[PDB]
């Protein structure tokens, strides 16, 4: 009972969602070498920003925004959309996140990489709480779409436009859940509530980054572009 439009849009949206995550060589994972792990993550990070931008460009509407607002939205979404991608790639049996196809990381690997636990745990917790929601590929795609068009993001010049763009994506996710799973009326609300969680995980991530300023550790200039104050 999804309209013609909606179903096709979700299809094309999941199309691009893989047509962008399928699309590289990074400094290898050590077997001081902690300084070689820090390099390793940041480069996976940078790869993801690449994927996220290319995704956004294919999300219908996005390119109707002016350049500055595209910047403003991507700036704030990036960490958030990463974390979503990170839960979607969480293997609970292994308790590991997996990033390209074979790279496998546990809550521990993240310590030798040089992060404090105050970030490392909420990340994994989050990946678990999303498992309990069990989303399919269309649901992530819509959710990610909805996250990008967050009109309250800082420095947005055209809030009203951004909200208008978000609207059809929330309609679509709403139907698709109503249909896909009719008796659980709470699923949809519980999904939007993951957007609230992400904003917190966003702060946690700011806090983690500022900590590096002191632990002596600089982000590559292109990541620093996005995450430093």
């Amino acid at each position: 009972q999804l309209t013609a439009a909606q179903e096709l849009m979700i299809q094309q949206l999941v199309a691009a969602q893989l047509q962008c995550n399928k699309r590289p060589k990074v400094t290898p994972w050590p077997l001081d070498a902690r300084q070689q792990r820090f390099a390793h993550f940041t480069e996976l990070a940078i790869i993801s920003v690449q994927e996220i931008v290319d995704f956004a460009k294919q999300v219908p509407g996005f390119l109707q925004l002016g350049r500055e607002d595209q910047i403003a939205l991507l700036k704030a979404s990036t960490i958030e959309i990463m974390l979503l991608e990170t839960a979607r790639r969480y293997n609970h049996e292994t308790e590991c996140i997996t990033f390209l196809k074979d790279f496998t990381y546990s809550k521990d690997d993240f310590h030798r990489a040089g992060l404090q636990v105050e970030f490392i745990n909420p990340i994994f917790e989050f990946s678990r709480a999303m498992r309990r929601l069990g989303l399919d590929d269309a649901e992530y795609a819509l959710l990610i779409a909805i996250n990008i068009f967050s009109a309250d993001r800082p420095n947005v010049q055209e809030p009203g436009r951004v909200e208008a763009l978000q609207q059809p994506y929330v309609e679509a996710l709403l139907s698709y859940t109503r249909i896909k799973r009719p008796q659980d009326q709470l699923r949809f609300p519980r999904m939007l509530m993951k957007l609230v969680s992400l904003r917190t995980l966003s702060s946690v991530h700011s806090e983690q980054v500022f900590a590096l300023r002191l632990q002596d550790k600089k982000l590559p200039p292109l990541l620093s572009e996005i995450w430093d104050v």
Partner: peptide, 12 residues
């Protein structure tokens, strides 16, 4: 400013 983003956007 925000050149990773600006460039990734202009690209292609």
């Amino acid at each position: 400013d925000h050149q990773l983003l600006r460039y990734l956007l202009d690209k292609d």
